[PDB]
Amino acid sequence: SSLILLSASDLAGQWTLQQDEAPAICHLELRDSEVAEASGYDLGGDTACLTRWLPSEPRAWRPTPAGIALLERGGLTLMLLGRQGEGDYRVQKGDGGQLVLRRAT
Amino acid sequence: GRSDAYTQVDNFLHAYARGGDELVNGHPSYTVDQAAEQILREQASWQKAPGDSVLTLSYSFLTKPNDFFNTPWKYVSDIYSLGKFSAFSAQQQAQAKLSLQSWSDVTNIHFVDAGQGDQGDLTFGNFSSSVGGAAFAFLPDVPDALKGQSWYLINSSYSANVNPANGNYGRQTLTHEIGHTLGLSHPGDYNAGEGDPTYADATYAEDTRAYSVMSYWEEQNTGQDFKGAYSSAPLLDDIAAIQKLYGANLTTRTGDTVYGFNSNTERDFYSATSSSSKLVFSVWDAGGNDTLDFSGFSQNQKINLNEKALSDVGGLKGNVSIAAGVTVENAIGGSGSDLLIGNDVANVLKGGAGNDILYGGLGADQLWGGAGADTFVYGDIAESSAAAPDTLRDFVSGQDKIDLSGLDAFVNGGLVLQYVDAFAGKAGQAILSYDAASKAGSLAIDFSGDAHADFAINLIGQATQADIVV
Ligand SMILES: [Ca+2]
Ligand SMILES: [Ca+2]
Ligand SMILES: [Ca+2]
Ligand SMILES: [Ca+2]
Ligand SMILES: [Ca+2]
Ligand SMILES: [Ca+2]
Ligand SMILES: [Ca+2]
Ligand SMILES: [Ca+2]
Ligand SMILES: [Zn+2]
């Protein structure tokens, strides 16, 4: 058996990435428009906000069989958020925290 | 002290470590063999027919629903309907054959084309009503009514299986499900759509698709990155697992094989066709003088020729590997600044353009730096003994460097070299020779101090004292 690899259109929309239940949060926009250089799709919204957790600002993303990957211009993964459940992706922080990606509203 | 060049070599030789006693990503770390045993835990397998020296399995593409599809509930409790049935398209059939072939290439199995219908030991078909995932298959320990079957989801909401192709998810899905029909399980206990399994549910750290196409987890979980591509053929642990069941195929690619650019493998997944090719493969080769040709990429690459080692090729991370028991002899870098690490046998390493770092390792290696300022690294005198010295085939004084900085004698023993015309029983004495006529030269060193050279490097091109780093 194999996992369903969701399409960019299946996940496109407004999402928020925040640290646990803490105030630290960033508003993101996952688009389904292709970005050739990164072998992915456009990541819009407040991506600059992400530099609070990443070494550089990602402007692309792509679905993975069990998650969502935020990418640097060349296509390498800067952050992989694993699917915990429908519309719930997470990654453990370097220290001990957790970043949670959920749809907006 | 150790140069940056030496450190780069040492660091990559220890990259992607696995099998240690400490936990990795909250999981125990397994060796290739441990992973193989784990993947075979259900102990399911096909029995070779009486009179056959090699397991022979036929395959066919269903033309209509079989008994299982018509009444699933009679064979699998959970399933009541699989929706609309559809036969494999021409593209699906062609790709399925390539996946089947990738399995028979590494182990002793002879697949036989049984055409269109339900006569094959293994059968393929499409369904439209998901049962939790993109596809499914049965291990060979199930009743004959289900044995050898693999099913693939196709509907208006999921099209990944419609056009399988080299490097995409549809192609890996074929290889994966076929793996099940042959006897392989997921490396851990989980099933698509059943609960909400995650990498945390894995039994061992290396349960990622950087090591097994049977894995559900991303290669990034273990530090690799294929930029969205998926291995179309069996990976390191898959090869080890399947070979435990039907043995190693010692008839495969016994010629002088080239992988990557200018490949003669006639396998899409082992071949690169442009500077943008995303390569993802694990080399299974049973003999010959072989080469990993990555000359067509411009990115800085890190190539490791040791068995079971992973390499960073064409801009990806840990995307190329060599199966356990395989000996690959040569490597060709690209126009970027590359790190080329040889293995225990005599290797031909060519850096190409860029400032490359070459490390021959044991054996008498033929090293070509190519254009640019190249560095030839030595970490142990045994790597270029007087009895079997390496040969630097295109050395350019003032540009290239012979790096001995990591040698124990220097970093720990504090030995100081004394250039002379002949040894006189003093450790550290070295002889730099060069014949303008033949353009041949050599560096000979007596580390022990017994007046006999115990380290030597042959040269095609002159080297001076300034070209040697200690
Ligand atoms: Ca060969
Ligand atoms: Ca070989
Ligand atoms: Ca060698
Ligand atoms: Ca190069
Ligand atoms: Ca050079
Ligand atoms: Ca070079
Ligand atoms: Ca050597
Ligand atoms: Ca000696
Ligand atoms: Zn499976």
CA distance B128 to B81: 9
- Tell me the three-class secondary structure of chain A, residue by residue: CECCCCCHHHHCEEEEEEECCCCCEEEEEEEEEEEHHHCEEEEEECHHHHHHCCCCCCCEEEEECCEEEEECCCCCEEEEEEEEECCEEEEECCCCCEEEEEECC
Asked if residue A71 lies in contact with residue A62, where contact means CB atoms within 8 angstroms, the answer is yes
Find chain A residues with C-beta within 8 A of B317's C-beta: 76
Say yes or no for a CB contact (<8 Å) between B177 and A66: no
- Last residue in a domain, options B198, B218, B250: B250
CA distance B377 to B342: 11
Q: How close is the Cα of B429 to the center of ligand 3, in Å?
A: 25
Solving technique: X-ray
CA distance B391 to A79: 44
List the beta strands (DSSP E) in B261-373: 281-283, 291-293, 302-304, 310-311, 320-322, 330-332, 339-341, 348-350, 357-359, 366-368
Asked if residue B417 lies in contact with residue B404, where contact means CB atoms within 8 angstroms, the answer is no
CA distance A56 to B35: 35
Would you call B222 helix, strand, or coil by DSSP? helix
Resolution (A): 1.7
CATH number of the domain at A1-105, please?
2.40.128.10
Say yes or no for a CB contact (<8 Å) between B225 and A76: yes
- Exposed, middle or buried, B275 (CB in 10 Å: 0-12/13-18/19+)? middle
Q: Which residues contact B94 (CB under 8 A, 6 or more apart)?
A: none
Nearest CB to A3 within list B133, B177, B317? B133
- Which CATH number is B260's domain given? 2.150.10.10
Interior/surface letters B47-66, b for 16+ CB within 10 angstroms, e for the rest: eeeeeeeebbbbbbbbeebb
Total domains present in chain B: 2
Angstroms from B77 CA to nearest CA on chain A = 16
* Boundaries of every domain in chain A: 1-105
Asked if residue A66 lies in contact with residue B217, where contact means CB atoms within 8 angstroms, the answer is yes
DSSP label at residue B383: G
* A4-A9-A14 Cα angle (round to 5): 115
Q: How close is the Cα of A23 to the center of ligand 8, in Å?
A: 68
Asked if B64 and B79 sit in the same domain, the reply is: yes
Asked if B220 and B313 sit in the same domain, the reply is: no
- Which CATH number is B116's domain given? 3.40.390.10
DSSP label at residue B47: P
Asked if B369 and B457 sit in the same domain, the reply is: yes
Asked if B316 and B377 sit in the same domain, the reply is: yes
The H or E element spanning position B116 is: strand B109-116
DSSP β-ladder status, B330-332 and B291-293: parallel
CA distance A25 to B360: 50
Asked if B457 and B308 sit in the same domain, the reply is: yes
The amino acid that residue B69 corresponds to is F
Residues with Cβ–ion distance below 5 A, ligand 6: B 351, 356, 369-370, 372, 374
Question: How far, rounded to the nearest angstrom, does the alpha carbon of residue A19 sit from its chain's CA centroid?
Answer: 13
Expressed as residue numbers, the domain containing B149 is 18-250
Angstroms from A64 CA to nearest CA on chain B = 7
Nearest CB to A80 within list B130, B132, B218? B218
Asked if B360 and B215 sit in the same domain, the reply is: no
Asked if B180 and B169 sit in the same domain, the reply is: yes
Asked if residue B368 lies in contact with residue B340, where contact means CB atoms within 8 angstroms, the answer is no
Asked if residue B268 lies in contact with residue B98, where contact means CB atoms within 8 angstroms, the answer is yes
Q: How close is the Cα of A16 to the center of ligand 7, in Å?
A: 54
Say yes or no for a CB contact (<8 Å) between B315 and A74: yes
Asked if B246 and B283 sit in the same domain, the reply is: no
Find chain A residues with C-beta within 8 A of B150's C-beta: none
CA distance B404 to B2: 8
Query: Cα dihedral sign for B108, B111, B112, B117?
Result: positive
Q: Which residues contact B90 (CB under 8 A, 6 or more apart)?
A: none
Task: Name the residue in chain A with its Cα closest to that of B160.
Answer: A5
Asked if residue B333 lies in contact with residue B311, where contact means CB atoms within 8 angstroms, the answer is no
**Residue B175 marked in a binding site:** no
Catalytic residues of B: 177
Token pair listed for B451: 């007046």
Angstroms from B134 CA to nearest CA on chain A = 5
| Nearest ligand atom owner, CA of B451 | 8
Q: How close is the Cα of B371 to the center of ligand 6, in Å?
A: 4
